[PDB]
Design a protein around this nucleic acid. Structure first.
Lengths: 213, 62, 136, 356, 75, 191
RNA sequence: CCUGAAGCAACCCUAGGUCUUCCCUUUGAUGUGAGCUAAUAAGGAGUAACCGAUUC
């Protein structure tokens, strides 16, 4: 006999400065009744927002994961967690009569963040090609995959997390790999399928509030 | 919703369980270009008028 | 009961997890986080017979109660996360998926962005039923 | 319609989907401020004219005044008295049922102070009647052909100006309102009456509304003439075949082919407040004879019934009009041009110097 | 359930209604007058034949199946 | 009268079918202008020959039903004549115009039916043809006047006048409009 | 043969009230009550009940 939504404060969510539309939406919490605190229970919530909604209007097939690493006051401050292509996109790309080449590198930014990036690329059929197949030999596949790893590491390793997200907002890494592997075997549908977050540095606030303007 | 006139342009085929509904290609008197497919009871002729309660819904062609 | 968003234009988004098995339907609205639940009306809470828990009808009732319940708290629009059973089992959503998604659009909500979130395994554990399948 | 010069600045662009979604409720009644001209009595005995018992379509010499907002002396008087949006029926009929537009058309907006003179270009093809505009294929013929869009439109305009007068008992005592026609035995049967519309968003609208004739039963008539030239190529059914079993079919088929013309004519009558709009079914002698015509039949429709029948929405008509009067009562003075994209479905708005 | 008991002969006030009312109706038929005065079709016919011969209602058509009168014109 | 053919004593001209859709399948004007409802027929010869029968004859045909009254067109013609007299008294319009309006107002727009993905079954909504509209319009207001007159003082001619007046109005009091709105409602309930 | 009846905004004529309001009385409208009808309304509900795989 207790209306359970009487004790619920709404909180506005904020995305970092790297995206056009700042505020993502609203978040529910329980009023600080007893020892457990609203903001502390609210800290560490993962928001999966499509880049179309995160920007004004663009590709809707790339999604960004954002963690409310701190709350300032009636305002959740999210920070880049991870990235994932949508099921519809990945399922649509993977089709028969070609070679699918998959790479993954475990690379660290200049600041603490250590990512795991997964790249994918499919062998392109030539404009005058009459052969049905368009397969790549095993040595051509692993020369492509070696080059995938070599770019994916170089692009992240040398600069910080604000700039790696600025690269993932387009697909500058996928376009760079695609143009690089034109000599070995022409690929076409090349993306960075997924970005994972393995390690974060011990939390700072001054470093967060540079990312939040 | 406003009631709108669809004009039969070409009778296609007969449908239903007991062959009871005539499935007909209609050309809208309102919009110049929009042509949809509708299941119709009773006997219908090439080049006459229907009063559709909705001018958006479409019947499954066979 | 007060989402302090603007009365004119501002849409408050939830996200509705429509888990549609072949013998049950779930309609479950949460935060964009996905942590805090708002509604969960199953196919089986509405109808009282075991054979029609996985009905288009039961899913239509469930989505209607969810739509009405979330309109009061002030969730205007919804993102959609459809799924079948997945794992070793079927990956075609249940027959309640269509009727539920339709029902909370007939009931005056707004539809954001839709996607399949079925647990598709890399390669899985051994499926239930013998080497010779389910013989009937 | 016009060749667009490099000095002409595009300011606003509106496409047909965006214009189709518009609405305005609350539009008030039209108030007859002035009623001018003299209108004849109609012979209801031209309706014993069917597929078997037709009539000769004769040339009648009666003078038609194609005077715009610019050259209207009553509007020129009323300008200073009250009103800030002045128009003719043909002009606002174009803007209202703009959604169906196929060919290139144009309207000169003249914002002199806090006014909108929705004017038309004299000595431009605005008072032509288009033919088979909205067919599966418009006539793809050349200017030297007789079945060309120009030549079909020429004769279509002629037979309409003929029919309006021919059907009429045009030498039996006329119905006079208050004034003689403000433009001048020699004259044609037409009455111009001016109406105020108070328009919600803070606009007063003074449009010139034209009745064609009077009929007894009294009753006001807007009268037009439907053309059938060469059906078999024209992408329509024959009229002379029977027309009696298929009247509803012959109507609805010629409607789709002339979607914008019949939409302009019907909203023309709704504007004027005519309780009945009549028609005239005119065809050739032989399918390639431009000179001869014979009147097959006529059918009468109450424009309120006809507009909900064919297709229109008063909310759309007034919703598109409030949008355009709001746009050009928002932006600056001088000569403008509402021109529709010749090949694509979108109306454009250019700002031009004081000359053209 | 319910039953209908019409009059075989006029009550004073029912005849007062008939003498005042039925020449005001646009349609005068024995069936209409039978329902409108709670009177048998025999009484209705006999009463309307009085009203006509008296010279008060304008008859339009007679037939064994259907006899129709109207209220007489004004001017 | 070599010019105008008054139906008994009712004018042919100055009756307009407003609805464009039902205009071809309603015969009242200019060539179907005949003195009597009665005629030879041959309207059951080919498919859409029926559309050319004067609507007054179509009403005269549909009226004579329920076994005991199969083929009594003379009795039915006198009923339609008496009904047209009574319509003119209570209304004051052209009785042919009131009939035409009642035909338009009574005809449904949508009806429910059984369709396919054959295996199981499904009851979806479909359109009615402009002939089916006028066919069912006549039948509805005929059976409405019929069943109203059964075990009643109100004579068949009066019951027909009641139905045609109230249906031409669009009352929901005539059996015609009542049943029309029931079918269009069910048609909506499963569309 | 008699049935209603007391002031008329102010001057002149006129008829001893040659006079038109209390209200008797009838027609046209609006609102409530009652009947028939809406209607088998709708909703309850394509829910409950009953039947369904299987054995030839």
């Amino acid at each position: 006999v207790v209306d359970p939504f009487s004790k619920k404060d709404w909180y506005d969510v904020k995305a970092p400065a790297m995206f056009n539309i700042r505020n993502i939406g609203k978040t529910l919490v329980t009023r600080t009744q007893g020892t457990k605190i609203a903001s502390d229970g609210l800290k560490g919530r993962v928001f999966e927002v499509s880049l179309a909604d995160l920007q004004n209007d663009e590709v809707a097939f790339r999604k960004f994961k954002l963690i409310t690493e701190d709350v300032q006051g009636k305002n959740c401050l999210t920070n880049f967690h991870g990235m994932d292509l949508t099921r519809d996109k990945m399922c649509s790309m993977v089709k028969k009569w070609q070679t699918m080449i998959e790479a993954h590198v475990d690379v660290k930014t200049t600041d603490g963040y250590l990512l795991r990036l997964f790249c994918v690329g499919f062998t392109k059929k030539r404009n005058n090609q009459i052969r049905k197949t368009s397969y790549a030999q095993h040595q051509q596949v692993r020369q492509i995959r070696k080059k995938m790893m070599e770019i994916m590491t170089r692009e992240v390793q040398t600069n910080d997390l604000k700039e790696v997200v600025n690269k993932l907002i387009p697909d500058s890494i996928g376009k760079d790999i695609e143009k690089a592997c034109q000599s070995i075997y022409p690929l076409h549908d090349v993306f960075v399928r997924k970005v994972k977050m393995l390690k974060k540095p011990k939390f700072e606030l001054g470093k967060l509030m540079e990312l939040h303007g | 919703q406003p009631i709108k006139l669809a004009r039969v342009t070409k009778v296609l085929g007969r449908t239903g369980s007991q062959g009871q509904c005539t499935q007909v290609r209609v050309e809208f008197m309102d919009d110049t270009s929009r042509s949809i497919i509708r299941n119709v009871k009773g006997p219908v002729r090439e080049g006459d008028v229907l009063t559709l309660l909705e001018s958006e819904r479409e019947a499954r062609r066979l | 009961s007060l989402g302090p968003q603007v009365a004119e234009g501002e849409n408050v988004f939830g996200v509705c997890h429509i888990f549609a098995s072949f013998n049950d339907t779930f309609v479950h609205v949460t935060d964009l986080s996905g942590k805090e639940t708002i509604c969960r009306v199953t196919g089986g809470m509405k109808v009282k017979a075991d054979r029609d828990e996985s009905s288009p009808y039961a899913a239509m009732l469930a989505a209607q109660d969810v739509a009405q319940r979330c309109k009061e708290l002030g969730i205007t629009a919804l993102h959609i996360k459809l799924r079948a059973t997945g794992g070793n089992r079927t990956k075609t959503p249940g027959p309640g998926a269509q009727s539920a998604l339709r029902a909370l659009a007939r009931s005056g909500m707004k539809i954001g962005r839709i996607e399949d979130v079925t647990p598709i395994p890399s390669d899985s554990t051994r499926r239930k039923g013998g080497r010779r399948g389910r013989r009937l | 319609s016009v060749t667009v010069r490099p000095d002409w600045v595009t300011i606003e662009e509106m496409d047909f989907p965006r214009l189709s979604k518009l609405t305005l409720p609350g539009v008030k009644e039209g108030e007859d401020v002035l009623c001018c001209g003299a209108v004849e009595y109609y012979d209801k005995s031209y309706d014993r004219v069917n597929v078997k018992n037709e009539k000769p379509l004769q040339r009648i010499d009666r003078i038609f005044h194609t005077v715009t907002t610019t050259d209207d002396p009553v509007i020129r008087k009323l300008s200073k008295t009250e009103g800030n949006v002045y128009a003719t029926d043909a002009i606002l009929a174009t803007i209202m049922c703009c959604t169906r537009s196929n060919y290139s058309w144009d309207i000169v907006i003249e914002k002199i102070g806090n006014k909108l003179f929705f004017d038309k270009r004299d000595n431009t093809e605005f008072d032509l009647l288009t033919v088979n505009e909205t067919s599966v294929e418009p006539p793809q013929d050349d200017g030297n052909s007789l079945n060309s869009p120009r030549n079909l439109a020429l004769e279509a305009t002629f037979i309409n100006h003929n029919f309006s007068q021919q059907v009429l008992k045009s030498n039996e005592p006329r119905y006079k309102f208050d004034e003689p026609n403000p433009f001048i035995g020699e004259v044609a049967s037409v009455a111009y009456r001016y109406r105020k519309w108070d328009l919600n968003n803070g606009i007063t609208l003074i449009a010139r509304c034209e009745h064609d004739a009077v009929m007894q039963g009294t009753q006001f008539l807007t009268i037009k003439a439907l053309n059938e030239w060469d059906s078999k190529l024209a992408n329509g059914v024959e009229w002379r075949r029977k027309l009696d079993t298929q009247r509803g079919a012959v109507l609805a088929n010629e409607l789709r082919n002339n979607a914008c013309k019949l939409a302009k004519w019907t909203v023309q009558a709704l504007l004027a407040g005519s309780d009945q709009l009549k028609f005239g079914y005119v065809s050739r002698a032989s399918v390639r004879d431009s000179s001869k015509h014979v009147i097959l039949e006529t059918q009468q429709y109450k424009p309120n019934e006809f507009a909900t029948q064919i297709n229109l929405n008063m909310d759309n008509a007034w919703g598109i009009l409030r949008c355009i009067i709001d746009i050009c009562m928002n932006q600056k003075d001088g000569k403008y041009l509402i021109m529709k994209d010749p090949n694509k479905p979108m109306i454009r708005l250019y700002d031009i110097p004081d000359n053209t | 359930r319910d039953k209908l008991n019409n009059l075989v002969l006029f009550d004073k006030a029912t005849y007062d209604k008939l003498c005042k009312e039925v020449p005001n109706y646009k349609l005068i038929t024995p069936a209409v007058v039978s329902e409108r005065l709670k009177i048998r079709g025999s009484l209705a016919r006999a009463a309307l034949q009085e009203l006509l011969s008296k010279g008060l209602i304008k008859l339009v058509s007679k037939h064994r199946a259907q006899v129709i009168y109207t209220r007489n014109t004004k001017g | 009268t070599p010019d105008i053919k008054l139906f008994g004593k009712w004018s042919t001209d100055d009756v307009q079918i407003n609805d464009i859709s039902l205009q071809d399948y309603i015969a009242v004007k200019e060539k179907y202008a005949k003195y009597l409802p009665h005629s030879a027929g041959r309207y059951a010869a080919k498919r859409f020959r029926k559309a050319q029968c004067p609507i007054v004859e179509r009403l005269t045909n549909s009226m004579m039903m329920h076994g005991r009254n199969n083929g009594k067109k003379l009795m039915t013609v006198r009923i339609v004549k008496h009904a047209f007299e009574i319509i003119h008294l209570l209304t004051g319009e052209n009785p042919l115009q009131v009939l035409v309006n009642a035909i338009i107002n009574s005809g449904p727009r949508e009806d429910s039916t059984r369709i396919g993905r054959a295996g199981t079954v499904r009851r979806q909504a479909v359109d009615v043809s402009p002939l089916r509209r006028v066919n069912q319009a006549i039948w509805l207001l005929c059976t409405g006047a019929r069943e109203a007159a059964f075990r009643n003082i109100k004579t068949i001619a009066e019951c027909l006048a009641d139905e045609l007046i109230n249906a031409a109005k669009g009352s929901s009091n005539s059996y015609a409009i009542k049943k029309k709105d029931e079918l269009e409602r069910v048609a909506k309930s499963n569309r």
